[PDB]
Design a protein around this ligand. Sequence first.
Ligand SMILES: O=N[O-]
Ligand SMILES: O=N[O-]
Ligand SMILES: O=N[O-]
Ligand SMILES: [Cu+2]
Ligand SMILES: [Cu+2]
Ligand SMILES: [Cu+2]
Ligand SMILES: [Cu+2]
Ligand SMILES: [Cu+2]
Ligand SMILES: [Cu+2]
Lengths: 336, 336, 336
Amino acid sequence: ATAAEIAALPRQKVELVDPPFVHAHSQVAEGGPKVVEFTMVIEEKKIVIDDAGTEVHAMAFNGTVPGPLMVVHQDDYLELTLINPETNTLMHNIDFHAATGALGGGGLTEINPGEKTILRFKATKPGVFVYHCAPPGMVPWHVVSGMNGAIMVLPREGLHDGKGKALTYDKIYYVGEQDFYVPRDENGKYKKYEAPGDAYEDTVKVMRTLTPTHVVFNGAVGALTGDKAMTAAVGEKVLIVHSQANRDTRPHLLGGHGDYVWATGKFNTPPDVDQETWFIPGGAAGAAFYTFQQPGIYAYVNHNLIEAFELGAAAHFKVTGEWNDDLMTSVLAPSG
Amino acid sequence: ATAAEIAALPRQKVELVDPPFVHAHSQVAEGGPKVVEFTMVIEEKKIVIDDAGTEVHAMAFNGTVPGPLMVVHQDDYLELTLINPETNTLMHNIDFHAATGALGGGGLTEINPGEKTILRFKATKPGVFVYHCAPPGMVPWHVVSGMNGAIMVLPREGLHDGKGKALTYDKIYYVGEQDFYVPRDENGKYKKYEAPGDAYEDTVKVMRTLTPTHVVFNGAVGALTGDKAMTAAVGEKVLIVHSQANRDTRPHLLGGHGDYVWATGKFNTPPDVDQETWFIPGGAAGAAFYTFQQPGIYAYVNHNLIEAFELGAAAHFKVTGEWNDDLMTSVLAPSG
Amino acid sequence: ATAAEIAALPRQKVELVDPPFVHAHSQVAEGGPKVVEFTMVIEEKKIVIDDAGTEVHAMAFNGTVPGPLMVVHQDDYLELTLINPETNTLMHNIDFHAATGALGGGGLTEINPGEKTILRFKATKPGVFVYHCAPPGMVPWHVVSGMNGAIMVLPREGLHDGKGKALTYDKIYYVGEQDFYVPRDENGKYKKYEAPGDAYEDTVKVMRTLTPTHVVFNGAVGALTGDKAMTAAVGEKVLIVHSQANRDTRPHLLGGHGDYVWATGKFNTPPDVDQETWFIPGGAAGAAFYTFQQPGIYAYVNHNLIEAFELGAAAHFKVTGEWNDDLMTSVLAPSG
Ligand SMILES: O=N[O-]
Ligand SMILES: O=N[O-]
Ligand SMILES: O=N[O-]
Ligand SMILES: [Cu+2]
Ligand SMILES: [Cu+2]
Ligand SMILES: [Cu+2]
Ligand SMILES: [Cu+2]
Ligand SMILES: [Cu+2]
Ligand SMILES: [Cu+2]
């Protein structure tokens, strides 16, 4: 539309929330197109990713791994203020796979420590999409240091199944999956470094083996288990957005299914149904909709079970409610 | 359905057969919902997986790797009697990806050697699904020791293409693909052990490399070749069910195609057509329907050709019938 | 069709062109079925795959890696004269995934140095398909030495989207992706060999790690960059055919999307839409259709970013035209 029209659209600032939770939004669009404003400060910081105190010099959008989920509707504009504090040591930028032009915005957002930038793009295609830092010449290093997240561009009319029936979730979670490549010394002990750059050579060597030392959800082994398990109740409809900016994954809800799964993450592509295990290629996000039918603890994993149970890619859901014996029952409990 | 309603349903005892064959069943359901009964004894045994005499301590449902294919129809109940003999050394259980609740049943079927259990679940979703053992804390180890198989939940009305026309097969085969991680000594020779637990620590180290030493069909290199090549004839419609409980695979019928392929393995998701090579993610089963049009030997492989021809993921079909020169002909045979 | 009917069909001799370009063709078929004739000479030749001078003894159809794209229409016959010159040292053949019977033609085309053969097959299924050499017992070695390419069997009515609307491209490119497994010495430096056979044992060892040392487009790191970058203009419709005969890939156009993507490469399977990153399993070809909307440089990569930027799987597009600030604009350029 006209230049005047774009400048006249309402501007709305949104307060972000850390993963796996999601900021306030409406499934069906409220009002016409808007310029949705977000601000994220980049934090380079050491984080511990396992039970052995293993460290990673994370490069984190908004201070978290993965970066937070930004939600807008189709044809809204997303206007991001990206800040790189003088306390950081590296130049960073951002590539929105949802965006069109300039390497997803990467070519217009290269900010050195002490700089900020504001990028606006029209969210023309509906779906969940990965976003990640991509400084020319050091792209994978930043991505596998945790500098990635995802956004969801909801259709203005909300989600629908393959027959056009509405699919309205009761709650949504964002599971960002991260492959880490941590160097080890000759004794097999993970190495620690004073500054991010100090680990560059050692890390690229591990990266070239295409074999991550850790594969985790929400930045650490067990981050979404125990007292940090995600929750639901029998009868509740849940949308699980999942992304992996660098490597393939195959999500599976143990004890459940993906009733409707937009495996490619794009809402104009009809969702697959009754899925046991879906597939999200590296560089993409996907979304699965499920209505819980049984109470109890569920595991949500990357179904290469070595990656899930040896490398860290396992989360839990704690579900409340009444057990359904029609669906499943122990006719004879374990006995001699 | 109420407990009383379920108790009034007819019951049918099924006798399982060893893969790649499939037990007798009817594509279109005969009558209303029934409780289909199966029994499987778990056998921990040594299996030789290659011609170098390499051994794996298999944990096998029904004594085979993969475990047998169980076939029921949507909304039937599958009632499994699972037995863990006193001669075994480990606790085992079963998780049906087709089931809803208690980690697919794994949480209700933990049986120590000398125990048995009976689990019943309602097959609410149509398609092929993986089932596998998953003892808490030792999940991938059992799965990559061959303790996995699949089931097929047929629509009550049999299979149909994307437009609803019936698809009826003449033969069905079940190919279970297994990734094995066999430890080697300092001389690159595969190690042998006299107890399953003795190889645990050494196997976990190999598993962590995410690089299998072997990738095979039906438990061993060349299993489905020669005396075990699958058979068909020109004009015959064949359904090939393929599962991989832990790692991705990309099936391809050399010289043929996947006319209709439910790549996700779920029948309510329309099948892809005219496939050359399809993709099944670790933790899932898929199914391809093909009508043979040429006689001869066909290879059926995981199309990462190193995995097929160096690691063992190759099977054969021997097809009888008349050659079709319209489809293919050697205009000039190899000559000087 | 009878032998007489086929003999009566018109013949059209086609001159192949080197990738990423595609020989002249008509999207909508001109007239009725034809026997389309192609000729390719196999060349075993040394090629350099990176700036360091790393060598590979390639086995190349038509002298290039990948082999050239052959284009025909559904129900035409593809008649290939394949020549193995006496200057080569190995037997070679060709398996067309588009063909039906004799291992894709591999069983009828085994030619030793000094021999030739002519194979004809009916292109019964529409889509892009891989073709590759497959000598019994040496299959993956020939394929990962670059002996593979693809063909495109267009519907007689040209391409259409999933709802029947015509999709007509302005330009087409064929990107062949190759995984290489180059042996290294004790200093971690790539080895060079006098003869191709000298490298066999060392190469098979690297192949078994399932970890390529290089993953490239058009036979070498950076092959499709600089003066050889692909080109387009704002408003231009481009079809990008991508193949990988041995290993999975996940194409992504940085700054753009796959507006319509036949991820399975089969035209009778409706294309996915608005894709960020699509997935092509090893042993298959896929195709993406995109209308460029923004000018500038774009990267086209396999989105496992380590494979793209460390191993070589990255190409560039140079796009002319006017910048669209509605789609994207830098509200505040990087500043303090
Ligand atoms: O069903 N998850 O192993
Ligand atoms: O076409 N099978 O290599
Ligand atoms: O958007 N490619 O990193
Ligand atoms: Cu960064
Ligand atoms: Cu990207
Ligand atoms: Cu077990
Ligand atoms: Cu499972
Ligand atoms: Cu060859
Ligand atoms: Cu092939």
